[PDB]
Ligand binder design. Structure first.
Ligand SMILES: CC(=O)c1ccc(-c2nc3ccccc3c(=O)[nH]2)cc1
Ligand SMILES: [Zn+2]
Length: 208
């Protein structure tokens, strides 16, 4: 059911999505091990992800969460990186895209920092890196991220350095509490709480 629509870089919708991508890059405590060394991306393509079935699945759930939370979906646009981006855009999110070993439990994880999600493009800890060169910091190979609509609803705050939600809540927010530059990270426990709206194709760029 899915079809992908290119946006022109002249479109304002492309620009703002790129802006979110570029402006949420940060340094990472692993020195660049997982996701590579870079301060910004070369954006190659941005595509709107259109799937009626998956969209209705998502809004049906949103209406449920909103009605459980004083008419407040608490909807966000967050980044997701995953070896299964192609599956995700054709079949949507489910328990097979959960991060089983994640710090907030087995769930689908999302980031405010694009560079956080970029660490998961080739797998956990960056895996063995790009398939062609086995290089976690490859500047050549094309990477892909999803920018997603995510219904957090009532989010359980966890301060820090497929399962269920903690009862009474629809998601978990990983409020970062050591690194003063790191943004929040979020976890949902049902695929229906995210829609993979944009497929961003990019290369990380070697710093000057
Ligand atoms: C292979 C698999 O099960 C898997 C796939 C993707 C991630 C992932 N984790 C995150 C954690 C925090 C913030 C963003 C992300 C993020 O964008 N992706 C984790 C595991
Ligand atoms: Zn490569």
């Amino acid at each position: 059911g899915t079809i992908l629509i290119d946006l022109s870089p002249d479109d304002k919708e492309f620009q703002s999505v790129e802006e979110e991508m570029q402006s949420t890059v940060r340094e990472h405590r692993d020195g660049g091990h997982a996701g590579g060394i870079f301060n910004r991306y070369n954006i190659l393509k941005i595509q709107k992800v259109c799937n009626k079935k998956l969209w209705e699945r998502y809004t049906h759930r949103r209406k449920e969460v909103s009605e459980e939370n004083h008419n407040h979906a608490n909807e966000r646009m967050l980044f997701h990186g995953s070896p299964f981006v192609n599956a995700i855009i054709h079949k949507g999110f489910d328990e097979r895209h959960a991060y089983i070993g994640g710090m907030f439990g087995a769930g689908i994880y999302f980031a405010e920092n694009s560079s956080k999600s970029n660490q998961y493009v080739y797998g956990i800890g960056g895996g063995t890196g790009c398939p062609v060169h086995k290089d976690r910091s490859c500047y050549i190979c094309h990477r892909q991220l999803l920018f997603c609509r995510v219904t957090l609803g009532k989010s359980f705050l966890q301060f820090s350095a497929m399962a269920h939600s903690p009862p009474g809540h629809h998601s978990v927010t990983g409020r970062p509490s050591v690194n003063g530059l790191a943004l929040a990270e979020y976890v949902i426990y049902r695929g229906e709480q995210a829609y993979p709206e944009y497929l961003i194709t990019y290369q990380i760029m070697r710093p000057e």
